[PDB]
Amino acid sequence: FERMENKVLDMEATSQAAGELAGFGIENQFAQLEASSGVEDELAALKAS
Amino acid sequence: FERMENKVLDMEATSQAAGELAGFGIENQFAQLEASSGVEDELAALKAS
Amino acid sequence: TEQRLNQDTQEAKKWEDRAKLALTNGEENLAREALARKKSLTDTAAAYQTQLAQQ
Amino acid sequence: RTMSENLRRNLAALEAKISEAKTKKNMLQARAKAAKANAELQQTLAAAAAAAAAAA
Known part of the structure; x- marks a missing residue:
């Protein structure tokens, strides 16, 4: 049981490390911003109606 | 056990020595500075808006 | 070269907008990155103007 | 750490x-590509001037 607990913890840390590190980078890190769509100007113009 | 402990300590020191020494050099040692990007002037100009 | 010039002069405005969208979130570390993307586009666009006028 | x-x-700086x-x-x-197109043109203009059909 003690030996098999340690394998689980090695799997978990391996998975989290890659996903955390893949969370960096401009394309993802900007995708988290709401106004990233680039059409904010014509939305503001439409809001004039 | 005593003989095999000493091999581990030789591996560890070999790995740390190379990485520590590779930590020197201008390109790395400047990469640790936040304003290293070189666009600070036009950022300051943008901050005028 | 006239087609290429019109692409880069509008790709730069995309990155100029995305920079201002970062400063309003205070994320200067990301705004500087977008400005660096803009710079190299403006530099190469000046090369097309020089090339095109000569051609 | x-x-x-x-x-x-x-990794980001790369x-x-x-x-x-x-x-x-x-x-x-x-x-x-542009430079190479002009090279072929200038070669053609020189070869035509070397024949000098107008002088013949």
Whole structure:
């Protein structure tokens, strides 16, 4: 049981490390911003109606 | 056990020595500075808006 | 070269907008990155103007 | 956890210049095609002047 607990913890840390590190980078890190769509100007113009 | 402990300590020191020494050099040692990007002037100009 | 010039002069405005969208979130570390993307586009666009006028 | 910050900054500083290289290569390949078209033209104009059919 003690030996098999340690394998689980090695799997978990391996998975989290890659996903955390893949969370960096401009394309993802900007995708988290709401106004990233680039059409904010014509939305503001439409809001004039 | 005593003989095999000493091999581990030789591996560890070999790995740390190379990485520590590779930590020197201008390109790395400047990469640790936040304003290293070189666009600070036009950022300051943008901050005028 | 006239087609290429019109692409880069509008790709730069995309990155100029995305920079201002970062400063309003205070994320200067990301705004500087977008400005660096803009710079190299403006530099190469000046090369097309020089090339095109000569051609 | 000092090494991991150092590596994580180095990793960002690489892709930042893959972006720069990839925009420059487009402008350089454009220039290489134009230069080579003018070379073939100037070669053609010289060969025509060497025949001097108008002088014959």
